[PDB]
Design a protein around this ligand. Structure first.
Ligand SMILES: CC(=O)N[C@@H]1[C@@H](O)[C@H](O[C@@H]2O[C@H](CO)[C@H](O)[C@H](O[C@H]3O[C@H](CO)[C@H](O)[C@H](O)[C@H]3NC(C)=O)[C@H]2O[C@@H]2O[C@@H](C)[C@@H](O)[C@@H](O)[C@@H]2O)[C@@H](CO)O[C@H]1O
Length: 586
């Protein structure tokens, strides 16, 4: 083994920072990115505490589809990255980079990436110590003839150089199963046997109308636990709103895939944190997002979605490392072996732990994410682990998995009910993680959680998550319900028929909208109410270390009921929020 160029694990998670090449400007002789970020400017803006855990991911987007274009653009940017000087210290501090080398099956009618040879990749790895990895993304919809053969070469060239091959894919058309050899293309399967320690496999939740979120995430977790990948994670994509045909928040009717650039702006900001929790809580450590202009920012400035949700969530997973592989293994009661493509794909988990076919969220944390691997793989390395002796490994074709009812009856016997209420909640150590799982319906949810004898009841509106940690002196609270008002994008349309017919915002139009109406002059959402009730409390709790999104919260209200040893906490806010409550139990 060659020394790894960087660590990627629970203590060293990874936030990929995408920069998409502007092909139109490249034709004019300029080296720029859609949305106006610059490589140096973006890197500089990244908070210093995050720099060790973030990597610039270059993407060739609409560069000319012919030989030389992607090489030219990439070499220019690798040179900029390599030569970077920190203006504070005057020292050359090479910017870490990942190159997108494969996308859309590398078809010459789809991407300039077609003309990036494995030879050239090897050359860049050898020239640039700051090239930490290469990235393949979104070929599920165009599963090219030699995709597995090329993936094998990408993994091997990365291992040769101590870099990572990172592959983001969704299980549409059995993609994950095919990648590992379901249909007889076994080159990547064999490559993985040798080189898995240099592989990161991620979901890509874009094609949301096909409902493969839960099954793909289950595979990513299972591949990791079974040593088919070094780590895992997810690319969470606001374009899911477009794929599923949604429009104005909470509105009636479906507009189909008709208003792309309005649609990728509309997903509630806090809902990205809800999606990301599914990665974190299940031991994933790699995060990436689209659309980049909304999820990260423009013009070397952080979008509010980035500043108030993603940055804060990512800081949380650095401060509180995800459960280790050993820990997740010890917690796993059931491990599925087989092809979800043969068992309804995403439907497998509907009314088990998802509330509908088309969602990136879960309705219960009772089973967390049940890990799986495709039928083509073996569970040999899984069973060899010291930590896997108590797992029931089950074929997906087992009677226990034959129907929705059978799945719950089987799982319920192994995963006890550990909270009450129709809401998402999952517990790790002394922390309850809670969210409202409604996607596009304005419905409050309630749950009853316990820390031993201490009872905590919560009431959450949609697009609200909380993390509640029992500390020696009380409770630490992290709350995020940040959701700005996107109604202006859907102006002039009273119903779905009118919305579908709106003039296209366009890619350039949406970038402009971000600049003029999101980065500044933001239409903030209304403050909304969260209730927390604690029962089993000695005296009126005190509040400490209160902070959150500027101008986004009223002072929390505490109402202590002496006779009933309980407090009702009422919060009115729209943003991220943090505080401690100090109290003793009664
Ligand atoms: C031939 C064809 O139409 N192929 C489609 C894929 O490109 C789709 O992939 C992504 O889908 C999104 C819609 O759900 C969207 O089209 C996205 O590209 C757009 O957004 C990115 C940033 O998020 C860039 O700005 C692109 O320039 C822009 N393109 C357009 C036409 O508006 C697609 O993602 C990009 O392309 C894929 C191939 C990868 O390279 C990604 O990394 C890129 O971000 C796919 C969705 O399921 O559907 C296919 O039909």
């Amino acid at each position: 083994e060659v020394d790894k160029r960087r660590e990627i694990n629970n203590e060293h998670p990874l936030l990929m920072m995408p920069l998409y090449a502007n092909g139109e400007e490249f034709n004019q002789g300029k080296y720029t990115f859609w949305g106006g970020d610059t490589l140096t400017g973006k890197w500089e803006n990244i908070p210093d505490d995050l720099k060790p855990y973030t990597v610039i991911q270059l993407h060739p987007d609409d560069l000319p589809k012919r030989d030389g274009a992607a090489r030219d653009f990439y070499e220019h940017m690798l040179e900029e990255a390599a030569k970077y000087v920190n203006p504070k210290t005057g020292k050359n501090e090479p910017i870490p980079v990942i190159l997108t080398v494969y996308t859309a099956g590398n078809m010459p009618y789809y991407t300039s990436a077609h003309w990036l040879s494995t030879s050239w990749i090897d050359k860049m790895y050898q020239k640039y110590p700051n090239l930490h990895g290469i990235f393949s993304t979104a070929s599920y919809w165009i599963w090219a003839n030699d995709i597995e053969n090329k993936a094998a070469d990408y993994l091997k060239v990365s291992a040769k150089n101590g870099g990572y091959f990172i592959w983001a894919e969704q299980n549409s058309g059995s993609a994950i199963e095919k990648a590992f050899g379901k249909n007889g293309k076994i080159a990547f399967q064999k490559s993985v046997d040798k080189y898995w320690k240099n592989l990161i496999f991620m979901f890509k939740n874009t094609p949301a109308a096909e409902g493969n979120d839960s099954t793909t995430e289950s595979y990513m977790k299972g591949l990791w636990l079974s040593n088919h990948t070094y780590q895992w994670g997810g690319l969470m994509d606001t374009w899911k709103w477009y794929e599923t045909g949604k429009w104005k928040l909470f509105a009636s009717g479906n507009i189909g895939k008709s208003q792309g650039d309005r649609q990728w702006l509309t997903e509630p900001e806090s809902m990205l944190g809800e999606e990301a929790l599914g990665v974190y809580l299940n031991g994933g450590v790699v995060y990436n997002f689209e659309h980049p202009a909304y999820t990260y920012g423009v013009n070397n400035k952080e979008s509010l979605l980035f500043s108030e949700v993603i940055k804060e969530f990512f800081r949380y997973v650095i401060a509180h490392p995800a459960p280790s592989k050993e820990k997740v293994l010890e917690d796993t009661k059931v491990f599925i072996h087989g092809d979800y493509s043969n068992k309804g794909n995403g439907k497998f988990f509907v009314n088990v732990n998802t509330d509908r076919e088309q969602t990136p969220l879960y309705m219960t944390g009772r089973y967390n994410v049940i890990p799986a691997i495709p039928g083509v793989l073996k569970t040999d390395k899984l069973k060899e682990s010291v930590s896997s002796s108590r797992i029931q490994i089950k074929e997906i074709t087992s009677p226990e998995f034959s129907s929705t009812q059978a799945r719950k009856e089987y799982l319920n016997k192994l995963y006890p009910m550990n909270y009450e209420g129709d809401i998402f909640a999952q517990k790790l150590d002394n922390r309850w993680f809670v969210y409202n799982y409604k996607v596009n319906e304005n419905v409050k949810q309630t749950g009853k959680l316990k820390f031993n004898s201490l009872e905590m009841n919560v009431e959450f509106e949609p697009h609200t998550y909380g993390i509640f940690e029992r500390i020696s002196n009380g409770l630490k609270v992290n709350l995020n319900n940040f959701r700005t008002n996107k109604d202006s994008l859907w102006s002039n349309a009273q119903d779905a028929n009118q919305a579908k017919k709106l003039p296209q915002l366009t890619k350039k139009g949406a970038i402009k909208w971000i600049e003029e109406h999101y980065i500044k002059d933001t239409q903030f959402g209304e403050k909304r109410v969260t209730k927390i009730v604690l029962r089993g409390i000695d005296k009126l709790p005190t509040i400490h270390s209160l902070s959150g999104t500027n101008n986004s919260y009223d002072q929390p209200s505490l109402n202590f009921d002496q006779k009933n040893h309980m407090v009702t906490i009422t919060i009115n806010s729209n943003g991220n929020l943090e505080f401690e409550l100090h109290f003793l139990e009664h």
